[model samples]
Target: AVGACVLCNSQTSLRCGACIRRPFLCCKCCYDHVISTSHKLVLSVNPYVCNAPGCDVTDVTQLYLGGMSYYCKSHKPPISFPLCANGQVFGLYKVTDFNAIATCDWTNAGDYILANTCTERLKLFAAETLKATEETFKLSYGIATVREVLSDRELHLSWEVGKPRPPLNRNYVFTGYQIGEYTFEKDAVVYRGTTTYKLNVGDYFVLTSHTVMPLSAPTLVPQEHYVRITGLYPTLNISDEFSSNVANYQKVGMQKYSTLQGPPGTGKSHFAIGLALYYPSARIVYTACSHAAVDALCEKALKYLPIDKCSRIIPARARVECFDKFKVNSTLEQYVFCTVNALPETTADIVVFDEISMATNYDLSVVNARLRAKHYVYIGDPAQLPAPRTLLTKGTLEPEYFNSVCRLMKTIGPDMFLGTCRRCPAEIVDTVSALVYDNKLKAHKDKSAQCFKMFYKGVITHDVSSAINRPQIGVVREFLTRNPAWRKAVFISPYNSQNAVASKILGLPTQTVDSSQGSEYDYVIFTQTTETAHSCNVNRFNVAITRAKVGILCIMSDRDLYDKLQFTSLEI
Candidate 1:
């Protein structure tokens, strides 16, 4: 039976239609058939007029045959057959000139068709070709050419519809590509094809899926809280050792006593605070070799615990009283008294001696004799004896006090030494520990080497100008200015020389060795020197030397004495 084909609606011999041989043509026919049958057709306007004079094609039947398609009347056949079967192909051509079409004419079937139908087919084909070329160029090189350069070597490329040249002197040429425009400028030169191409912002460019957007700058978060604690005590994990040692003393029915020995930056002060924190109900009495040490400990306590907590533990009024008389209430149950004689006869739960090694044998013996506390914690380095040279000369009686304390610890059998140092670099601690105590206690060599090298590298010379002398004051002022961060500093002397020096140069009050025992400094300057050999006291020199954590700088006129004391210099 004869039937209309679904795609072209022409009379066909079979149901599938033998004329529609292509797979795509058959698929289109099937799609149209389904849509036409399933949906109601809404006619927007009636097809009206035929404009071309000789054309009479009309109706859906002629449209299906591609005869009454758009531009059918104006279309003319080229002077070629089969190639220009549909005269609407010219629109597919990319280039405005005929060169693009003629360039490929050897391979293309329609070459000379110039009829109206042919012209229309050529135009349509030109338009389709132009669009395909644009898409292909964009996919490959990230640029679509708006105009082709046949006479000139340079190609004018742009993202805009009309090709425009990049601005002169302003456009940054990346890689080696020179972008040009359709219109030539006065100063512009003809470009040879020597340069390689690179991409620009407005140029049609392709990007990989992996390309990521640039990241923004980072912001800094401010820290809200800061707390610093200094002193010696066992860390939280090692608190059991401390408790066990104390418990051992209690088991033996003997008083608990331990001595922690180390140089500055060793957690002596921290240890003391930890002990106080450990014993909440127990009254703890803190005694130092000097008032400065007591004040420093108080400041440290305030820093570790909040101000309100510290006030609750040790009120400010009580602190003021203690500062005035060198005695204060340490806790609700315990009082701290500086004077050995003035200390209460009542028993204390704990008695802490910051610089126990600095106290005289008599003073230590007298203080211990009065101690009724179950635990006695002594924090100081015995190796750092306050006045080793002079104290030895002062009837050799002072060593006996250290000897007595050592013997007492042995007799009681409760002694613990804290080995870790947190402040100074491990190397510095190691070097100092090695020199001072035969043990290699710290891990860092840089810290010890730096401190040791700074002090003993040069000869110890003295500048004998008066304390107020500009040159002498300048030296100290410069040192202090450079190290303004140091808080632990003290000036020491036997005579009123320290007073004069402190007043004129330091612009602060003077303090004697006994008064400055617990205090430390980044740098210490001693100003007194007696002329006579017999008047020179070794104890006074030792006192001054030991006051500094970093080093001691002595200002003296006696060159002989400075050289003589060279043996006491520490090794780097």
Candidate 2:
């Protein structure tokens, strides 16, 4: 006969044999009851009859714990229930008192472990001694089974959540062909064959697998559900179909947490701004990885909304050039603008984070702060450059350091990307699309390829043997001087020494591919000063060539490498 479990009211098999009433319970409750009350419980025992050969102890309760063999009071085992340790049973022992110090496990087996369950600060206690020691062991408490309840002082626990992840190492071993380094502000990326892999001083071998061993010292990088106004707010229905249309994305924003992927030249920033306007009453938070990106979004908002209605918070680490010019004499307002690090105390209905891929995991942690939001729309291109200072082990050793929001974005929510090539010209759109986006990008027919013919053949290249390539510098200097329109140009290079050389001669500020992420220019003179073109990353090349709206000029030392890279040879 089936009965309801006294603890959870669910149908169960096991029962408390010690209790006079013999209350039926689930396997969890049967085990937990002994842990809580120190009372023996029977599992898989027949409730109808007892196991005495001569005497038929039918309709009578059993006092001993047995699997398939039930015994009456007269013919019971020496101990009420033998406690199993590891795999074998131990002698009878009594617990003076015991209580569950940690949060109770869920009744439903289907329920997932809450996020708070696995947090580092979780401390379990065996209150028999009235002292709780923090256990720092890695545990995935999927279903914590009471393995042993020996005495008042000691308790053993085991969970059925499979193998828990190992503890993070302080240091990691990166094996690769070492290349150059690029540093910006307090951050740096050490490139090894175009892949940014960190290195330490050690005698190590470069292996086929990216193996990382535990080292002594660790590296440190110094950088919640909101209520919805149910009846009053305007709402949109979420759809199965996803498109580049703003209406379709408005539905995505309403679906609590979602991602809106925008490749370069797709106007994702503009799309985010327009989405905010749809919910006029809703307090929106517009944050981006960089101040330039946030300010650019703010500038776009000013076109549709009033200055007083918008508020932009600039971080102390923000660049002076990217500062908001419109807010020179203005004050902060309702619609918030800030980096993830400096979010204000105010709550938000919608949070649209731009250029999200550039932000590290430390930066993404801010999204879960006290400043709450009901809906989140993460916007970025993961296919672009990841956070430059991100680790090479890809967070294998220390996840909190190397992981970016891009990694989180994939598993966090449903995503939709804007596929139209609106920003790049028709001339270079196809080239960029084919190279980076797997030819998924569509170009506007109206943007004529003829307009870019006036520039240095849409794409220009020169092969040299020397590192300095003094002839390339002289040519670019004269070209910028003669053409006043080309003054809105930038010289981009991975090598800092090359940037320094070009910056001195061209009399213009030179930027690395990382620094020039949010900015666009009419012309880009990419000076590759390395003796050999050994490092060529597809994503890096995408960011460099796409920055130029009109044209790009490449000065490389390896012609054979250029021939191999088909995207570099786009001459109009």
Candidate 3:
């Protein structure tokens, strides 16, 4: 026959006769279309060959594993012998066309699946299946071992064990603990004002309380911190991507370059650190466009990266140091902070290229060529702002490579994205979803989805006739007085002239929402500079809303701009 399935007009691997009429069939049609009881099948001559020692029946499609060399249906077949797991059995000529697994579900057995025209389907499956298990992989980010602080049963202080952190990599905010333990090992103890303290546990500490430490290490902190997690689960639901994340991480760890993207506050650092912890043997050179962003990533690295294995890449001229005190003989790249732009030259095994939305095509070429290492991970938001047009446009960048991150994503490796917003308040999250996902600026509720709610809770527009409000200042100042560490809280404005002047009026440091928040805040105060009629690119304004981990309070002098921006929900 023509070796084509007459029912679907597709090329088939097995030809059947003596059953309905003689026609070829694909394995899928064989599974769902026909009754096989009366059919006699012959393997196509081009795809599969008999595995038995001497049979010359290359076109035999029927099950003929009687231990003989093999046979054609014309040769009067005997009872079939089951093919072993290692046996060769292919479905279609191409790997992708093969659909259903050649299953041995015990309900049915000895099926006509793969044969000539191009493959031994079962053979292909066994190979990939075996390759999956036998092949070894190096880690991309590696490890950062977090020291433990046990209170009883609960986890204390963020401790990371990935991406080359040796020690002193414990961070993440929390408070309270009338209930559990902050455990740790003897070797990883906290040095105090005079005495010593420790907490140890073998795994990720689930309960992170900003608790007053037990008497053994009593204090709100070595300094202080706070609590979050919207009313949902305590941790982000990373369970859906568990196996794929680990497997793809290994692939990225072994690749030349790749990308992992996500929206704001989507926990890119969380998963990147997870990968780092998975591959402790690999060194990671992390870089970003904003020094502030890099600085923020450093805080995360300290919480999750290992002490001896990783270093924060800092500006070449900066005189300050965080881990400089831990220097051994005042040397070793792993022991000190990683210098900026030096990443291309560093001998580190993996390069974690961050803030990629700002990278130019030329920037990619230089850094890509300089990083001779086989592993790299690009992290950033594709939806966020791109490099200014003058620096990287059709004139400066390869049109095919819109952004350097996309260029690096060319590697045929693993890529992952975080979909949940764990750091933004539900109110801000609603605004973001409407713009990016729903194409409207309206309220949306995802109160009980992925990561817990870790925000200040609501979006309130406070009207003040002028930029300064002495009455509001007193209230804001006293709160800052109560929670000194929440000093990250800020008041931002679209106007260039207002930051310092506005800060005194609001009682919190103030800045525009343009940069420095590769950064998040416990709270953000945004002021409008123009009227509601002032055209604002919602996408451009995304950064301001996402910056606040807790709340986004829009400070305004007029009530008109407030309602025009569409604070109302579409569901309404």
Query: Which lDDT tens digits does candidate 3 get at residues 1-572?
Result: 34555335467665543322234556555434223232233345533345545655443344345444454454434765422112233345412222322221111111111211113222223223222211211122232233454443333344444543221211111111322222221122331111122433333323231221101111000211113211112123334534346654655644455577667877676666655555555555666555555555666767766665544544443333333322222223542233334343545565666766665433444454445444656777655655433111122222113343443333331166666677775667776766554432223233322111111212323233213333333344544566555566677654333444556455577665554346777767565544332114353466666777665555343443344333322110
lDDT of 2 by residue, 24-125 (tens): 555555556555553554543344345668856542223334554556677766654433323322211111111232222222211111211222111111
Ranking by TM-score: 2, 3, 1
Indicate the TM-score of model 1.
0.39
TM-score each candidate.
0.39, 0.52, 0.44
C-alpha lDDT of residue 505 in model 1: 68
Backbone clashes, each candidate: 64, 0, 77
User: Which candidate model has the greater lDDT, 1 or 3?
Assistant: 3
In model 3, the runs with Cα more than 4 Å from the true position are: 1-244, 312-316, 319-340, 387-402, 406-414, 437-489, 531-535, 555-572
List ranges where model 2 is wrong by over 4 Å.
Answer: 1-244, 315-322, 325-332, 390-405, 408-414, 445-488, 531-535, 557-572
Task: Estimate, for each residue in 15-117, the C-alpha lDDT of model 1 and write its tens digit.
Answer: 2121111111122332343223321111112221232466653322122212332323334233312111232111111011222331322222132121101
